[PDB]
Amino acid sequence: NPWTEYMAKYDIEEVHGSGIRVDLGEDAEVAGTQYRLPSGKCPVFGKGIIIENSKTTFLKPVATGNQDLKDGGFAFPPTEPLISPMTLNGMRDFYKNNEYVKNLDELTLCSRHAGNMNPDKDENSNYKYPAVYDDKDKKCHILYIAAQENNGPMFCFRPAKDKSFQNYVYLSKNVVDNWEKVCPRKNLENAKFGLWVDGNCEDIPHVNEFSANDLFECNKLVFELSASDQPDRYKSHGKGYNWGNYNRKTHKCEIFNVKPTCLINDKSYIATTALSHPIEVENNFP
Amino acid sequence: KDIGAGPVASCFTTRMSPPQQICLN
């Protein structure tokens, strides 16, 4: 297969290895009690948490002391020294003496910064808060609340890719420092995912067709159906409907749950994944 | 706990050197 190297970033079980819609792929202990926490190796572009219909609430600080949970968001409340939110330049200055951290790309730096804050009195606790990086403001928001969904017939909330979240990047403690090379980001224009069979790229044999007005709506649908760790039995390990072939002519999102192993050059298609940014395209067919 | 409910924390100790105590407020 001449596509092996190129296609490695689309093997979501391997490269990401946890849920996408809801990432709770590991467990960590804080003072004798076990907690679930995000563990995906790739950044999730465009993911936010919608709280009771609100889109501008989840990055607000969490409720402080004698405040109700619904009165706040999910982010770290004000600290001394102020470590959240923190601009990219702020983080680079905060870590100026640490040569192993100060020059990390902004997404890895935000993950490492959130992961630096141990809530336990024990130095060996593996509990590492996730974070959201906002590309518009270049601000890392550490998330005090690691939960991503609480739905069903208060504090009701769900993960989503919404136009208001298009510049947000959801980051677990495990985001890899070379995500730019090994993780998806851009949608592939003029390409559709396929399966390599006896020297040819064959179509995915079975797909689930959802109608979609544009690429954003297709990416949103793939995200909705993607790997989810929401209730070891609950862990996806990255298995799910993580890929879609968007046909821009018929306005169809062809969603599937097997990893793709090649690309087909087809001008009617754009290849997307639940991790991918909901807008950005790359038009360089390899 | 099954949906990601987390610990109640007021102060944090940095993991990377130099270790420092960062508290809420």
Residue numbers in the entry:
A (entry chain A): 108 to 260, 273 to 350, 388 to 442
B (entry chain B): 2027 to 2051
Give sentences from the paper:
Two important components of the MJ are Apical Membrane Antigen 1 (AMA1) on the parasite surface and the Plasmodium rhoptry neck (RON) protein complex that is translocated to the erythrocyte membrane during invasion.
From the 67-residue construct, PfRON2-5, that we previously showed to have affinity for PfAMA1, and guided by the TgAMA1-TgRON2sp structure, we synthesized two analogous PfRON2 peptides: PfRON2sp1 (residues 2021–2059; numbering from the initiation methionine in PF14_0495), and PfRON2sp2 (residues 2027–2055). Significantly, there is no polymorphism in this sequence among P. falciparum isolates. The two co-structures overlay with a root mean square deviation (rmsd) of 0.81 Å in 304 Cα positions, and the two peptides alone overlay with a rmsd of 0.34 Å over the complete length of the modeled PfRON2sp2 (25 Cα). Our study allows a detailed structural assessment of polymorphism at residue 225 since complexes with PfAMA1 from the 3D7 (Ile225) and CAMP (Asn225) strains were determined. However, Ile225 presents a deep pocket to Arg2041 with apolar contacts formed between the aliphatic regions of these two side chains, while Asn225 presents a shallower pocket to Arg2041 with the Asn225 amide group stacking against the guanidyl group. Nonetheless, our binding studies by SPR show no significant difference in the affinity of these two PfAMA1 homologs for PfRON2sp2.
